[PDB]
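Help! Submission page says 'invalid entity' but I think these are all valid:
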Amino acid sequence: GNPFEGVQLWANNYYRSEVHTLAIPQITDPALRAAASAVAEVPSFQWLDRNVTVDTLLVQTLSEIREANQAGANPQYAAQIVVYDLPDRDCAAAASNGEWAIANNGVNNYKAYINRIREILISFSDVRTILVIEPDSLANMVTNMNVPKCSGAASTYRELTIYALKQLDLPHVAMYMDAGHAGWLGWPANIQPAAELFAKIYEDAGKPRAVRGLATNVANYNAWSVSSPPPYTSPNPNYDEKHYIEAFRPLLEARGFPAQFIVDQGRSGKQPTGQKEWGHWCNAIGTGFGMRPTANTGHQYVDAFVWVKPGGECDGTSDTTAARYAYHCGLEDALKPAPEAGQWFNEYFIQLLRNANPPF
Ligand SMILES: CO[C@H]1O[C@H](CO)[C@@H](S[C@@H]2O[C@H](CO)[C@@H](S[C@@H]3O[C@H](CO)[C@@H](S[C@@H]4O[C@H](CO)[C@@H](S[C@@H]5O[C@H](CO)[C@@H](O)[C@H](O)[C@H]5O)[C@H](O)[C@H]4O)[C@H](O)[C@H]3O)[C@H](O)[C@H]2O)[C@H](O)[C@H]1O
Ligand SMILES: *[C@@H]1O[C@H](CO)[C@@H](O)[C@H](O)[C@H]1NC(C)=O
Ligand SMILES: [Mg+2]
């Protein structure tokens, strides 16, 4: 019952046109240009990380897929969407672009957001829809509760996650909850508390049919499988996503949640990366496009390799005067100068293209 089996993944026209209009005209290497045209067709997730995206991007994407499917696509296309707008978002981060706050009607705002997404998904029940639920949320409950904002947000994160899981439990949907990455939850000491947390949420949500499992490495750079531990991973024995997932799944399953995984590989092709520390997430140097999206993972715990963060779209500005500036985006191992989050960062795209593995 793998939701990635038996469908094509939609490659959206926003990314395609960023590559064709902004990137390709700047490439002076004939080989790099050809590879860019290929990357434009690789299907990546689209992000509902601001409320305004619900009645715009989500509707537009689902309408375009419906049209392609009604025109005879074989196999049918599926949508890939990230739900990312919890109140007090990113609780352990020094800076966040989240728009809502628990202290300022954020619970109600979030429930309304989920309710509206549900309405739209019900109207597009002919489009198989794969969701990643809330990057950078519950993984903080495992390791970052010492941060006062995380201790304060934890009960709300749990309650609103349960809400989302129940509300978005629709027959044509598959959901994967974010579960960090090997350098977050994969440390041996964190695996059991993570398993307890996620399995209990699954149980408390009533084990909804649509909850397929967990998503890892979202918008991060870890290898699926590398033969040598990158230096910034030491001394974690679970230094890639395969190690993490193989240690984590049995603990989850023993607690009633036989979670299947999807693994972001969109910026994982070059290993080791140029990260100086594993927690350096923003516009990291020394990275490349990784394994293309596929259901044919070879691994029974992994439904798919995916591209959740679309490589080339900026993670955050390096403009330190900007209100939304995050200090991680100004580190030595972040590519600079970088535009606002989500804006096209052509120099980053070209880095990823040059470093792609497998090559395009
Ligand atoms: C053992 O645990 C201890 O050590 C650990 C390190 O070994 C760390 S792990 C560490 O934790 C922290 C949190 O505590 C995070 S920081 C964090 O990381 C995220 C991953 O990149 C990002 S998500 C980010 O979000 C943006 C908004 O959506 C987007 S821009 C967005 O892009 C889309 C698509 O292009 C576009 O459509 C939109 O228009 C744009 O807005 C961006 O690309 C993303 O990167 C998040 O912001 C951030 O807070 C680390 O990742 C992690 O390694 C433990 O914490 C510690 O206890
Ligand atoms: C979120 O967007 C919806 C439309 O999709 C709008 O009705 C609602 O007011 C917005 N929420 C907030 C808190 O502004
Ligand atoms: Mg093996």
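Support: the input was valid. A stray whitespace character was the problem, and the output above is from the cleaned input. Residues 267 and 289 are 5 Å apart (CA to CA).
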